[PDB]
């Protein structure tokens, strides 16, 4: 029952929580009525009625929708760039994100253009020409690919949007039948990173490099150690991973902030369900996964796949079905973290979690202490928070009985915060000392 919270013991910095609007999935929303646009963007970004999300991940398209859809005559020949100021809805989405509280934009390529790769195709894998052990008859396209990624960044800068981070790979351990590009190791990745870093700096930009968005955490572990041995981590700003093939239950050995940059239930229907049977698309399942990432794997960020799309399955947090906008249970799992744990928060020490209650705590830059308690028991659990002396508490809960986060009746005795955590619920305490 007694949880100790220790703000003098701190761990990782929190960068935030977010999602993507890649592959044109958000473009019908970008083109919808002002009323639909407002409903969708408030669900994603509002800190009072939505999920308060703080990170947007955009895709850099490789062929169709690319800024360089047609090969030049060779790897050092003058490119022909295109720019429509739309980017399949991502310019609109980026401007909405900046207007409504997003702290970081990350632009991530799923592949280089086909003419820069060993397989001369945007899909079914292939390697960037000129990386270690990847010789192409047409030559070494490393500088061409760095120049291409910088032009995309400048295109966004010309629309007034500053990209914070750039990634040059997506799941490079995976070769599906759509935009993809591989690496054999972090050692091979290290043959391109210095070229990209130098090209960004030379263009007068400060964009940070993120790598390498593996399909699973086990490759993020392997590749980070290889990048460190190759001396490439000095050029990186973030280490990234997806959680599809494997999840994190331990932190990566790095001083860089680590982002979980894509994870979702891709298979199941969209559901408003918070808890029913522990299914993969349930809100409470996702509360526990975010908890695992932030508390067990020391993540600085946790991203879903798609924020909002039309006729969504579970791959999206919010759906647009005609003119009707609906929030998933998963959206409210994100909300119970993201509304309250703001960028530049630091995770802090807790001890004394009851059985099957997952606890985390955070200190915001403004000094608020956020304690999250996920009760996975089939019964209410009474807790007390010692180690902090509260002057005030605002608390919120989410369970099957409410349709969105609702005021929670916290106790406060002699500066000790407490409460009765409902069964199969999440409670967030925002404590002022």
Ligand X SMILES: *[C@H]1O[C@H](CO)[C@@H](O)[C@H](O)[C@@H]1O
| Cα angle: 294, vertex 242, 127; to 5 degrees | 145
Given the rule CB under 6 A, which of 28-36, 71-79, 112-120, 197-205 is the region that contacts ligand X?
Answer: 28-36
Q: Using the rule CB under 6 A, is 27 a contact of ligand X?
A: yes
Q: How far is the CB of 69 from ligand X (least distance, A)?
A: 17
Whether 198 and 142 have beta carbons less than 8 Å apart is answered as no
Given the rule CB under 6 A, which of 23-31, 52-60, 198-206, 279-287 is the region that contacts ligand X?
Answer: 23-31
Tokens of 356: 């099957």
Q: How far is the CB of 324 from ligand X (least distance, A)?
A: 18
Q: Which of 89, 293 has the CB closer to ligand X?
A: 89
End-to-end CA distance of the chain: 21
Q: Which of 293, 307 has the CB closer to ligand X?
A: 307
Q: Which of 60, 220 has the CB closer to ligand X?
A: 60
Tokens of 222: 């392997």
Q: How far is the CB of 94 from ligand X (least distance, A)?
A: 14
Q: How far is the CB of 29 from ligand X (least distance, A)?
A: 8
Phi, psi dihedral angles at 290 (to 5 degrees):
-65, -40
Q: Using the rule CB under 6 A, is 46 a contact of ligand X?
A: no
Q: Using the rule CB under 6 A, is 313 a contact of ligand X?
A: no
Given the rule CB under 6 A, which of 26-34, 263-271, 321-329, 395-403 is the region that contacts ligand X?
Answer: 26-34
Q: How far is the CB of 85 from ligand X (least distance, A)?
A: 10
Q: How far is the CB of 28 from ligand X (least distance, A)?
A: 6
Q: Using the rule CB under 6 A, is 30 a contact of ligand X?
A: yes
Q: How far is the CB of 161 from ligand X (least distance, A)?
A: 17
The residue from 1, 31, 70, 162 that contacts ligand X (CB under 6 A) is 31
Residues within window 335-374 making contact with ligand X, judged by CB under 6 A: none
Q: How far is the CB of 113 from ligand X (least distance, A)?
A: 22
Q: Using the rule CB under 6 A, is 221 a contact of ligand X?
A: no
Q: Which of 118, 312 has the CB closer to ligand X?
A: 312
Site string for ligand X, 62-101 (x = CB under 6 A): ------------------------x--x------------
Given the rule CB under 6 A, which of 27-35, 63-71, 151-159, 321-329 is the region that contacts ligand X?
Answer: 27-35
Q: Which of 44, 374 has the CB closer to ligand X?
A: 44
Number of residues counted as binding ligand X (CB under 6 A): 6
Q: How far is the CB of 86 from ligand X (least distance, A)?
A: 5
Q: Which residue sits closest to ligand X, CB atoms considered?
A: 31
Phi, psi dihedral angles at 45 (to 5 degrees):
-105, -20
Which residue ranges make up the site for ligand X (CB under 6 A)? 27-28, 30-31, 86, 89
């Amino acid at each position: 029952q007694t949880i100790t919270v220790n703000p003098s013991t701190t761990y990782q910095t929190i960068d935030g929580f977010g999602f993507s609007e890649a592959f044109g999935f958000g473009a019908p929303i970008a083109s919808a009525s002002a009323s639909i646009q407002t409903q969708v963007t408030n669900y994603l970004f509002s800190t009072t009625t939505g999920a308060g999300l703080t990170i947007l991940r955009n895709r850099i398209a490789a062929g169709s929708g690319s800024i360089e859809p047609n090969a030049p005559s060779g790897p050092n020949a003058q490119p022909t760039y295109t720019w429509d100021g739309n980017d399949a809805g991502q310019v609109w989405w980026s401007k909405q994100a900046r207007a409504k509280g997003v702290k970081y934009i990350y632009a991530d390529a799923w592949s280089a253009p086909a003419f820069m790769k060993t397989n001369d195709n945007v899909a079914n894998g292939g390697y960037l020409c000129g990386t270690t052990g990847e010789t192409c008859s047409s030559g070494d396209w490393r500088q061409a690919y760095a120049n291409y990624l910088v032009q995309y960044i400048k295109d966004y800068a010309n629309e007034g949007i500053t990209i914070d981070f750039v990634g040059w790979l997506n799941e490079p351990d995976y070769s599906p039948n759509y935009d993809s590009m591989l690496i054999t190791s972090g050692t091979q990745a290290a043959s391109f990173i210095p070229t990209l870093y130098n090209t960004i700096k030379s263009a007068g930009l400060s964009t940070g490099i993120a790598c390498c968005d593996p399909f699973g955490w086990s490759d993020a572990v392997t590749w980070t150690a290889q990048l460190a041995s190759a001396g490439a981590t000095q050029y990186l700003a973030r280490i990234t991973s997806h959680w599809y093939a494997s999840k994190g239950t331990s932190p990566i050995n790095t001083s860089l902030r680590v982002w979980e940059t894509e994870y979702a239930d891709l298979d199941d229907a969209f559901t408003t369900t918070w808890y029913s049977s522990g299914a993969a698309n349930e809100g409470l399942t996702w509360a526990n996964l975010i908890w695992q990432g932030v508390v067990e794997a020391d993540l600085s960020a946790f991203l879903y796949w798609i924020g909002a799309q039309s006729n969504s399955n579970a791959a999206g947090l919010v759906t647009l079905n005609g003119s009707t906008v609906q929030a998933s249970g998963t959206l409210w799992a994100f909300a119970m973290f993201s509304r309250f744990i703001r960028p530049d928060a630091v995770r802090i020490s807790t001890s004394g979690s009851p059985s099957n209650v997952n606890v985390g705590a955070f200190k915001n830059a403004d000094g608020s202490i956020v304690v999250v308690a996920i009760n996975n028991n089939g019964n209410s659990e009474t807790i007390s928070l010692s180690g902090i002396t509260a002057s005030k508490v605002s608390a919120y809960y989410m369970d099957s009985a409410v349709s969105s986060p609702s005021t929670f009746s916290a106790t406060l005795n002699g500066g000790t915060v407490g409460g009765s955590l409902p069964a199969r619920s999440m409670v967030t305490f925002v404590i002022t000392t």
